Amino acid sequence: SHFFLPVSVVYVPIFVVGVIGNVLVCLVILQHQAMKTPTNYYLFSLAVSDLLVLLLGMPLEVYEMWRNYPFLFGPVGCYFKTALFETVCFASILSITTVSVERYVAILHPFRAKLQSTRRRALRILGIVWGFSVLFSLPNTSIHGIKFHYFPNGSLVPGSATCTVIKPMWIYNFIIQVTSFLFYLLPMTVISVLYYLMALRLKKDKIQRPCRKSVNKMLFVLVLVFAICWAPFHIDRLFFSFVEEWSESLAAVFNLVHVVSGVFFYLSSAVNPIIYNLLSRR
């Protein structure tokens, strides 16, 4: 089925919440920039990446709902847009992973994180992560093709073109499966087990006890919503795997899975900046 009104009606408040959260993060980052910790710089980079993916998804989503074919966008345009979207999503998830691991090593070794004033190293790390995200999004974007309008009439195409994955289905399927597994099994397990060890450490450590209990429950709910929000984006690609079965009902349920994955990813990108900067007002 095709529905444009509910998609926009549910994406407008999500986008509003996302831009409001990004504005709040930018405001609290501008305040006391000298006292800002490298973790605050990581959070600012994550917020900028969230804004990038939001303003790359919402306009493209409403344009696709209005017309499936791109409007005033050629092949290089689709290539650049897909590359930017993929690298921004990769940078977001990888920066979340690095934030998790740095929080883990800081709560496990506070003296180690306190010494040496590890500030420029954080900048170099985020730069190398952005570079790795670009280098990983380049091959997945290079494998993309426009078949044709493909109508056996006339002399020219009637302005119909899609920016799909026209490359052989086996290679693209293997690439998507490898990407989905390497971006779900490894980093989700990392952020789960590291935050679980943090939970055990804070429970062994525990005015102070209510704060520790609140931190523990917020940790639990954060990992829960992170799993529940990053599960659809990969169950979609797994549904792409090994089963095509071109029909009407399976196509309909696949489109429903796609739109629910999209709205879940949108709400996740909107809630991440406001849920990561809840403890610290600055």
């Binding site: 095709h2 998804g57 696709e64 709902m65 017309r67 499936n68 074919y69 897909t82 979207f85 993929e86 997945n140 309008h149 109508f151 009637p158 119909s160 073109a161 899609t162 920016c163 799909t164 994955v165 984006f233 979609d236 690609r237 792409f240 071109w246 009407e248 196509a251 696949f254 489109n255 796609h258 739109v259 994955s261 999209g262 990813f265």
Partner: peptide, 25 residues
């Protein structure tokens, strides 16, 4: 309207019945 643009069920436009929304990738 067979002389129209598409006039067939397989078409990139909306309301086709196949996968309408492309994956986010």
């Amino acid at each position: 309207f067979r002389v129209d643009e598409e006039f067939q069920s397989p078409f990139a436009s909306q309301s086709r019945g196949y996968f309408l929304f492309r994956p986010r990738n």
